Design goal:
This is part of a larger assembly, with two copies of chain A (431 residues) and two copies of chain B (430 residues). Chain A has 431 residues and is of the alpha/beta class. Chain A is 43% helix and 16% strand. A six-stranded parallel sheet of chain A has the order 5-4-1-6-7-8, sandwiched between helices. Chain B contains 16 helices and twelve strands. Chain B has 430 residues and is α/β, with parallel strands linked by helices. The longest helix of chain B has 21 residues. In chain B, 44% of the residues lie in helices and 17% in strands. The chains are: A alpha/beta (431), B alpha/beta (430). At the A-B interface, α2, α7 and α13 of A face α10, α13 and β11 of B. The structure holds guanosine-5'-triphosphate (GTP) (2 copies), guanosine-5'-diphosphate (GDP) (2 copies) and magnesium ion (MG) (2 copies). The site of one magnesium ion (MG) has 4 residues of chain D, from loops. Chains B, C: It holds the Pfam family Tubulin.
Chain lengths: 431, 430, 430, 431
């Protein structure tokens, strides 16, 4: 187990990155100035021959505003200045700009850094990509990087965390175009994508957590724990270690179906923690309830195809088997017929850490679930419906066309998206 | 850094600009002499957006003040913030336009057009990454409508890629200030409808209403109306100047707001607006701001939005905020006012949040709406236009400046198409 | 939390409301400026029921004050508690109603109806779980009877599920204050008889009697009568504001009290009422309160209950209590006054107890009775109505405001049905 | 013997619950803050892995007023915040509201908690349900829960404590509708119901106790002792333990006759205690007198069908047999012919505890009787008479109809109630 490289693209990805790297530093004990006041922090950090550890990340954006905060923020000393790549003019929520016109200018600079980062790795498990599914830079430039990375690093894991457009909440008018276009250009190249919706996490903050005034500092901070659970196996020892490539081997039965949804348990406030045991069954049963999943799509509306329970902390393997056995016998919880075995257990010894000032309570035992469910097809369909509803009248096509993109690309994108919907239908039925 | 250059034409444009720079300079903590006396280091982080730094910490705004007669610009020099602008940027003529679009576009302003471009080009070169231009003027005046459109056409030919915003004061429905406004407005729109990317229509009648009832101001002067216009003008560019959780530059607003290229006429709004008497009795929270911005009583355009439908809407918040509240309130407006948005656009709201609030407020929001109700505004102007042009009411003044009558019918026909295009999209697929 | 919005129309409604909010604010320990200076934490537990919390601990009551002429509302501003209401809720017209239902319902008030709804809707949205509306007015006046019924019909169409209480001052039997009361009352009842869920009939004649003998007050002013009306008004909503052993919200009272939908006219009562001379000589215990509340001498309606029968009765107690005493005393009244209750309802008393007493009292009770004797009140008004309308005594004023004579006979016929329905249930199965 | 779950619904049930749980905590020694300053308190409590014990209860109401007191009361820390389920608008004493309109909205939230409570039980004896027979929430919502619980937990004990309308005292005008409607919907689902009348307990407080100013804090506190006696066998050891399911097997000869009445002895003030021996016969003979039963119906007017004497404290089994033998030879006390054996003895070692500030004296020996007597038919008949007396003229039917209920339901309810009266007639006669 050796390096995994994290690429944070766009305002969403970068703001998630600083939350993630703040979490990484605390777990390994690296101060905010990069000094290490033992042998496992090399996966995400490089020792600068002086006791100073540099994160193995490339922060890319087309606007200086977001990366300027990091340069002037508390973690200014942490990051290598050359890694913080920034553009001149934002993508203006336009996929075409982020991909063709302004994206092409800065793509080479990013690849130059990635190659230098990759060369200093004895082993390179893969790439983590943090981006927003809806947006100019976070969706147009990531498609460029996915295409560029694939040719150079074929058959290396390329994980991505994507902010899928919420079914009901939206913060931009042309998201359906941006989201569908990026899906077309990443389906063939990406290995698997962990989907999270802002609306779903907002609901958790109100019901599970007692925070009545959540902010993106809360969503990103909570989302950071998801990545920590996924990469804990690389960075820590424990029974049933789960490497990075085991995810694509287990959670992706077919090449085009690689969009597992995210779930995390427990998520409880400090006051509400005193009244709960939080045993292995207690946390485990929460992961399979609609009230806790981080995508607003209802899992009960469909069937599962694979799951990976990334247990963490003071947990006992026997209880994991017993709790999992109880889940499989539920009639309400349905697993597709052609997959007799759906669970991919993983256990780690390092408990989750407590971020000072956070809204999450100290838990000596936590579980993170990654599940590939056909219910996510209900999310693509709404995106498809929202697309042709605008494209029929050419709602905003002139902006995209003028940026060096052809109208035919819109037709191809939906046609590829239409097949993806059909694929989930085919896999969800058995004789 | 992202940079903008400000252009102000005519009495209306210059006087709005004067108040606009007072607001902008105050936020960044700039002394009237041009020195910086602010308290927060975050003000200088993006001061390059509007001000060119000169020797000795004297920040000079890159604004081009154009007026065919020295009168209005002369008062700006003697104003409280007169000594901040660069003297060479005061490109003033001698023979002022007689409130006719022809003189300000063909005969007199055409002689001064070359001089203005010299100043603008120097400013554009002074920038490292120019974003777009801003024009403040009135559609009913001669110099503003004439010189403003002449500038827009020229700079567009020289900066096709960049953006150009136009904060244009539009003739009021009931009370007018000039007799020949219909001719100027129709001709001016014919130029803006194809040369500018976004427009912020404002009318004095709506601003008078806001002061009368929404602010309980007994004696409103243009020292008061121009502040509301400036406040909205500052809100649109806050993301460029200051950081936030979800940012939106000028290009981001235009792409989201404009479905079709010719339907780029908007109507702005601002919140909170509260009288000192009613300030104590109202709570300042996101839910309260959302109701006011979508209230037809707060729009800065005479056209009532309820008479039409919204194609796209943008609300730019400022100050400490809660993203959940912003999304919930926008969700409420989306559902509650079900019929106020065209269905063929599944979601119409584009949100943006900035960390810094304006002046002493702890929270504020700026509203932008691409409603189809604005078709009513163009409808009235065309009706007034045809009423006069039917028998050449005041056409000899325009024809004597070199204009041809064929231009008036071309502008009329082009204007009529815009209303027809607006009416087409007010329909629904089912 | 459960929430109510208060509406007060006309001189009678506004002046009752002013005293009502003085009582309500005093119980919750609110300073006249709107600040909270109470001693018990239990006052803020349900302060959301009546007050919207503003910044700085300034609690603003969500009351809508409506009057077609500024006069009455102007005095409220200068009153002791004038500075607590929100200025924007003072929706006042200019041309006051001439004590004719037509003007306050069709011509003048119809122009102000839209403005009032704007204020009410904002209040309703400010609530998290709205329960119902309250209207205070007089049936003999023009604005109150006219505007009040116009408001009731409109809000009912917009809030069918919610409740609406109506504390209506009813014309006195012997001495009247207006010549044309019969026309206003009959028309007003025709609207209330089908649009409101519960009514609290009050008459000045009964209140004058209470002060004269039950309270030994030599010089009673409307500063005194409105306090008794307010005291009963506060009692009805005590369970919402404060906890108790057995609670009863507004909906609970209506369901128990109203057997049939059209028989929703009640007569209130209060206890203890004792003069300072007789205060020393009387013991304050549950048995003493029960006798007074059921005493015909204490009813706030002219109609003598003994002339009819009770369909349902509700006694809402307050303060430290003994449930056994409450049940025993109610059992005594049920048996002793055997013939005062209709048999076809086996039990007629709905009880409720609240922990907190009112003002300085250690114990209090509010009486509500759905007696059939109130048919006498409607009988007299119809007799007076037919006496005038038989030869169109004052009908030209109403017909000149747009009303048709056919409406008067429709109201008369509808009113006659109510008396007939009341008389039907005064009979017994055996 | 393992968990029994307590559901407290309505103002009556909740106010009874806080009296009951105050009693439970003192018996086991759990402080008011949930800390346990040994192996038998697990029936009604769950150990929160930290020395803090959470009651195994679900408090449900449609109005925040009653549950708000608990949240701000001394036992705020005791209850799990999620268990204290509260609605927005009360049921307004309307059965239709509590069942159809407002009940349907909050039913799912309750069942979600019950399922989580049930899962953490190795053994689930059954459910205790505290409610008022007359009232909106206490009668309309309980019918929903009974129907919902039955489908999920068939053949598990569902005990209920009901405040039957007093024959003479009444605090609401539409109780006959509410009481008859709930009886129809709970007769098929409920296992057995322990009936108590407020008027009957008021009489005891005046005659047996010397309290001239009783309050609901006295009735509920006294009623709490009834439940403690019933569940002492589960929570304590002693000769002739009586499990929860023995009640339904012994006290219910026929499925539709499951309404035993309540009786408790001794009930004496501190001063009056000094002048009484309070031997086993002394307390036992009191249970069979009209002056002490907690339902105003006169037992002498009918015949018994089964009885369960739940003795408690320093009691000797021989005296129990002798005292019971004396009762059976009484001619005035009559037992139905077809039940040669009527008594179900039960003895426990733990004496009743003394609630500080209470009106009950310290007794080292107590007895609680549950008896299924045909005399209770005199209580149903008065309810039936009070129903048709109003329904003939449609006294209040419009309120119920408007809330999504059909008029025909009223006819069916009385018809089912009419048969129940006939059943007691049939069982009460023998050749
Ligand atoms: N969870 C979360 N989502 C974010 C955050 N910041 C932005 N987003 C999401 O990003 C979506 C829009 O795309 P952005 O990422 O903001 O835009 P971008 O990636 O900078 O690309 P541009 O169009 O060039 O600005 C919004 O709908 C947000 O939901 C964040 O900090 N946390
Ligand atoms: N013994 C006893 N009875 C009570 C208590 N509280 C209420 N009751 C009885 O409950 C009956 C009325 O039903 P409630 O329980 O009060 O009403 P509810 O259950 O809250 O249902 P709603 O109609 O929605 O209010 C009254 O007749 C009382 O006798 C109590 O604390 N102890
Ligand atoms: N809002 C606003 N409008 C103004 C102001 N001054 C002038 N106007 C408008 O400008 C219009 C007159 O055109 P004007 O710009 O003065 O003519 P110009 O000098 O040739 O451009 C009038 O209709 C006014 O409504 C101002 O200070 N504020
Ligand atoms: N109890 C009470 N009744 C009042 C008061 N003021 C006016 N009234 C009654 O109101 C009636 C007159 O109607 P009014 O409301 O003044 O006319 P309006 O202004 O058009 O609604 C008279 O019969 C009075 O009995 C008051 O302060 N208290
Ligand atoms: Mg961006
Ligand atoms: Mg209740």
């Amino acid at each position: 187990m050796r390096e995994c490289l994290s690429i944070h693209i766009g305002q969403a990805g970068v703001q998630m990155g600083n939350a993630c790297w703040e979490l990484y530093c605390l777990e390994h004990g690296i101060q905010r100035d990069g000094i290490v006041s033992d042998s496992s922090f090399g996966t995400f950090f490089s020792e600068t021959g002086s006791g100073k550890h540099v994160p193995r990340a490339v922060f890319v954006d087309l606007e200086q505003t977001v990366i300027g905060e990091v340069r002037t923020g508390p973690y200014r000393s942490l990051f290598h200045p050359e890694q913080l790549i920034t553009g001149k003019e934002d993508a203006a929520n336009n996929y075409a700009r982020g991909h063709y016109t302004i994206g092409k200018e800065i793509v080479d600079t990013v690849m130059d850094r990635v190659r230098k980062m990759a060369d200093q790795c004895s082993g390179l498990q893969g790439f983590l990509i943090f981006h927003s599914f809806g947006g100019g830079t976070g969706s147009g430039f990531t498609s460029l990087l996915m295409e560029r990375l694939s040719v150079d690093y074929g058959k290396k894991s390329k994980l991505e965390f994507s902010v899928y457009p919420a079914p009901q909440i939206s913060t931009a008018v042309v998201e359906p175009y941006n989201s569908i276009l990026t899906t077309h250009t990443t389906l063939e190249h990406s290995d698997c994508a962990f989907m999270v919706d802002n609306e779903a996490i907002y609901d958790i903050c109100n019901r599970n957590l007692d925070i009545e005034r959540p902010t993106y500092t809360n969503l990103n901070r909570l989302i950071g724990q998801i990545v920590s659970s996924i990469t804990a196996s690389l960075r820590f020892d424990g029974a049933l270690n789960v490497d990075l490539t085991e995810f694509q081997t287990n959670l992706v039965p077919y090449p085009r179906i690689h969009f597992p949804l995210v779930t995390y348990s427990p998520i409880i406030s400090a006051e509400k923690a005193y009244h709960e045991q939080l045993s292995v069954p207690e946390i485990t049963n929460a992961c399979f309830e609609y009230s806790n999943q981080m995508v607003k799509c209802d899992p009960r509306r469909g069937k599962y195809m694979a799951c990976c329970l990334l247990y963490r902390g003071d947990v006992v393997p026997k209880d994991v088997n017993a709790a999992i056995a109880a889940i499989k016998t539920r009639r309400t919880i349905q697993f597709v017929d052609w997959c007799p075995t759906g669970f991919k257990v993983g256990i780690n010894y390092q408990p989750p850490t407590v971020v000072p000032g956070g809204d999450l309570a100290k838990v000596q035992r936590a579980v993170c679930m990654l599940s590939n469910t056909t219910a996510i097809a209900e999310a693509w369909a709404r995106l498809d419906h929202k697309f042709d509803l605008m494209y029929s009248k050419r709602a905003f096509v002139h902006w995209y066309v003028g940026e060096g993109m052809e109208e035919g690309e819109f037709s191809e994108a939906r046609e590829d998206m239409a097949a993806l919907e059909k694929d989930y239908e085919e896999v969800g039925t058995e004789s | 850094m992202r940079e903008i250059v400000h252009l102000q034409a005519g009495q209306c444009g210059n006087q709005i600009g004067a108040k606009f720079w007072e607001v902008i300079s105050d936020e960044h903590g700039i002394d009237p002499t041009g020195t910086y006396h602010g308290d927060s280091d975050l003000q200088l982080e993006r001061i390059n957006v509007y001000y060119n730094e000169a020797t000795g910490g004297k920040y000079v705004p890159r604004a081009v003040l154009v007026d065919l007669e020295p009168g209005t610009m002369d008062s700006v020099r003697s104003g409280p913030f007169g000594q901040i602008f660069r003297p060479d940027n005061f490109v003033f003529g001698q023979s002022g336009a007689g409130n006719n679009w022809a003189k300000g576009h063909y005969t007199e302003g055409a002689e001064l057009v070359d001089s203005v471009l010299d100043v603008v080009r120097k400013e554009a070169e002074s920038c490292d990454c120019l974003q777009g231009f801003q024009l403040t003027h009135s559609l009913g005046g001669g110099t503003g409508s004439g010189m403003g459109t002449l500038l827009i056409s020229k700079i567009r030919e020289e900066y096709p890629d960049r953006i150009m915003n136009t904060f244009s004061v539009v003739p009021s429905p009931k009370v007018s200030d000039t007799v020949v406004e219909p001719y100027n407005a129709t001709l001016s729109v014919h130029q803006l409808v194809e040369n500018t990317d976004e427009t912020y229509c404002i009318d004095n009648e709506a601003l008078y209403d806001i002061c009368f009832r929404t602010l309980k101001l007994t004696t409103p002067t243009y020292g008061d109306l121009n502040h509301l216009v400036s406040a909205t003008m500052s809100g649109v560019t806050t993301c460029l100047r200051f950081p936030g959780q979800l940012n939106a530059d000028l290009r981001k607003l235009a792409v989201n707001m404009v479905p079709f290229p010719r339907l780029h006429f908007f109507m702005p709004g601002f919140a909170p607006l509260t009288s000192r008497g009613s300030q104590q009795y109202r709570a300042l929270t996101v839910p309260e701001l959302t109701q006011q911005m979508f209230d037809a009583k707060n729009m800065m355009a005479a056209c009532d939005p309820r008479h039409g439908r919204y194609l796209t809407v943008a609300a730019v918040f400022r100050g400490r905020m809660s993203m959940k509240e912003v999304d919930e309130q926008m969700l409420n407006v989306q559902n509650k006012n079900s019929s106020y948005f065209v269905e063929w656009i599944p979601n119409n709201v584009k949100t943006a949040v900035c960390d810094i609030p304006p002046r002493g407020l702890k929270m504020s929001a700026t509203f932008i709406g691409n409603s189809t109700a604005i078709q009513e505004l163009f409808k009235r102007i065309s009706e007034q236009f045809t009423a006069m042009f039917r028998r050449k009411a005041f056409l000899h003044w325009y024809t004597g400046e070199g204009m041809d009558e064929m231009e008036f019918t071309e502008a009329e026909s082009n204007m009529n198409d815009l209303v027809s295009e607006y009416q087409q999209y007010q329909d629904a697929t089912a």
